[PDB]
């Protein structure tokens, strides 16, 4: 039901600094006022994070996404290998109500999208879903900063999240904030490349203000500090400087 588009929009992709953001809880273990050294797959300190103003991007090990979001125009996510009926494709949709997740051989078009009819009902991202097994529904997820980490380990999709109110204009702030685990999916797919949904006004799609940050993860060793309450308050990257 989704068709071609003539206005070949291009996103003004710039670069900026990652600073010390993107730290999550690696395990469900409580610890109190200690310094624990852990070797895992993180976002290296002071890295090169890409900024966008629906491009195709690789997944690699894992993907860090951030948005100083206004009005939550961005809605969903697509994951998979080929994003067609030939391979299982994971789909996530978050609207103002109960959010939904599927894994089906969705046959996406060249420009899949939701579309909003202004009382709203428009959903033509895919065209067919014939063979598929798993489905899922859960509570709603979401000017203000929202940070998400997406990982996939041994048949286990993993979503970590964090939210903060922010007042800085453009760049990432010089702050520290650990990321709590949010959702796990014990389903095995070969996800290696993903997408990003948009809520365009269809009645002529009007989607021009789509700014968000994307970064990639690598394996390395960190040193985390736990306070009395067992919340991560500081971290040190081992392979950064001689001092580190």
């Amino acid at each position: 039901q989704c068709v071609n588009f003539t206005n070949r929009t291009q996103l003004p992709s710039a670069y900026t600094n990652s600073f010390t953001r993107g730290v999550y809880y690696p395990d469900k273990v409580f610890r109190s006022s200690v310094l624990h050294s852990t070797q895992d797959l993180f976002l290296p300190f002071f890295s090169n994070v890409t900024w966008f103003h629906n491009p195709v991007l690789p997944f690699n090990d894992g993907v860090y996404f951030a948005s100083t979001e206004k009005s939550n125009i961005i809605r969903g996510w697509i994951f998979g290998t080929t994003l067609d009926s030939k391979t299982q494709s994971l789909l996530i949709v978050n609207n103002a109500t109960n959010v939904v997740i599927k894994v089906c051989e969705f046959q996406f078009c060249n420009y899949p999208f939701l579309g909003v009819y202004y009382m709203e009902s428009e959903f033509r991202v895919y065209s067919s879903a014939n063979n598929c097994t798993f489905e899922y529904v859960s509570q709603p997820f979401l000017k203000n900063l929202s940070e998400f980490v997406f990982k996939n380990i041994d048949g286990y999709f993993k979503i970590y999240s964090k939210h903060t109110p922010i007042n800085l204009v453009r760049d990432l702030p010089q702050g520290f904030s650990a990321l709590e685990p949010l959702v796990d999916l014990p389903i095995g797919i070969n996800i290696t490349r993903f997408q990003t949904l948009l809520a365009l006004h269809r009645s002529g799609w009007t989607a021009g203000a789509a700014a968000y940050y994307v970064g990639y993860l690598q394996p390395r060793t960190f040193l985390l500090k736990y306070n009395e309450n067992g919340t991560i308050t500081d971290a040190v990257d081992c392979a950064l400087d001689p001092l580190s």
Partner: protein, 366 residues
């Protein structure tokens, strides 16, 4: 024991270390989170009605707890036959998900549903491979599906050139061509309807009544499992050296209540050198503390074989509450060095004779 370890028939005055004491665990406890998200079986077994046998209703069951105890122990089911796995251990064994096939067949057709079976239902309606794992449950539905005027809502496939492959539904309404004369989609000289409707009535005899049958098949593809039976959770006992199995993690110790403040997602804590030191019960969400069961060495205080034969016993670093032949013995003293049995504490003070520890020591007078 002192003579044996020292390897002599004479013992000089002193204190000697002979063996070790370790408290033993009493019983086992296991706790698991609340049983919830029951698999949707009642809505299938005891629904309004069932689908036809050639159009059998297929359901996929995943992400739920599959309680089979009430299913197996239900006495309202006419036939409950499991081929692949033992019904009694179904609460233990589990595959990643389940398939349900529900339909209505005549009473005589119940035995037709089995691996390696041939028949109208067994060939033209549904087929089961000889490697099938799962169960078949059949029950009477004469009071529900059979109609006094004749139940014609259920049909079975009777005319087909070839038998159905296992796990396949044929809904094609092509008119079977009995002879060599092709028919233009209708019956005729050598053509008839492949599907035949039932004539179920309450007046029908044994085996002629409508029976609702559900076949459950278990499949365990390499994807992580979602369907498993309920797990029994025992009760918890505090202040007793026991061995526990909290939500899959096992350990031995005394289990007390603790005031630590966890965080709404982290389950259990640990202190240093990777030793478990706190757990949260999945049932009540309370922060409990764990302490290893007591142990220590034992020492024998003697004044010398030449003098006497009575001795005292010291349990090192052991609380003077669970000591237990000297379960009671003489008066029992508690000191920073442990617990002392066979000696009495006086208020005097002399030169030290047999060093005990923490500033105290013993001598012979008793």
């Amino acid at each position: 024991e002192t003579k044996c370890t020292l390897k002599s028939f004479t013992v000089e005055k002193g204190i000697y270390q002979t063996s070790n004491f370790r408290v033993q665990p009493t019983e086992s406890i296991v706790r698991f989170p609340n049983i919830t998200n029951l698999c949707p079986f009642g809505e299938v077994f005891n629904a309004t009605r069932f689908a036809s046998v050639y159009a059998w209703n297929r359901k996929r069951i995943s992400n739920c707890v599959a309680d089979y105890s009430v299913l197996y122990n239900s006495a309202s089911f006419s036939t409950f036959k499991c081929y692949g796995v033992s019904p009694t251990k179904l609460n233990d064994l589990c595959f990643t998900n389940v398939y349900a096939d529900s339909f209505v067949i005549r009473g005589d057709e119940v035995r037709q549903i089995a691996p390696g079976q041939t028949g109208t239902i067994a060939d033209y309606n549904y087929k089961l491979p000889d490697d099938f794992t799962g169960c078949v449950i059949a029950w009477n539905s004469n009071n529900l599906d059979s109609k006094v005027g004749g139940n014609y809502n259920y049909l079975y496939r009777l005319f087909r050139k070839s038998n159905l492959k296992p796990f396949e539904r044929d809904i094609s309404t092509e008119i079977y061509q009995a002879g060599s004369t092709p028919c233009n989609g209708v019956k005729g000289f050598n053509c008839y309807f492949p599907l035949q409707s039932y004539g179920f009535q309450p007046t029908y005899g044994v085996g002629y009544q409508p029976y609702r049958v559900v076949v459950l098949s278990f499949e365990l593809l390499h994807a992580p499992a979602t369907v498993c039976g309920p797990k029994k959770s025992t009760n918890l006992v505090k202040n007793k050296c026991v061995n526990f199995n909290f939500n899959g993690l096992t350990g031995t110790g005394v289990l007390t209540e603790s005031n630590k403040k966890f965080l709404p997602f982290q389950q259990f804590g640990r202190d240093i050198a990777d030793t478990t030191d706190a757990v949260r019960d999945p049932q009540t969400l309370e922060i409990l503390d764990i302490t290893p069961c007591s142990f220590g060495g034992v020492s024998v205080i003697t004044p010398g074989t030449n003098t006497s034969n009575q001795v005292a016993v010291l349990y090192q670093g052991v609380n003077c509450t669970e000591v237990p032949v000297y379960s009671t013995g003489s008066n029992v003293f508690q000191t920073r060095a442990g617990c002392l049995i066979g000696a009495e504490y006086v208020n005097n003070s002399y030169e030290c004779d047999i060093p005990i520890g923490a500033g105290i020591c013993a001598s012979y007078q008793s």
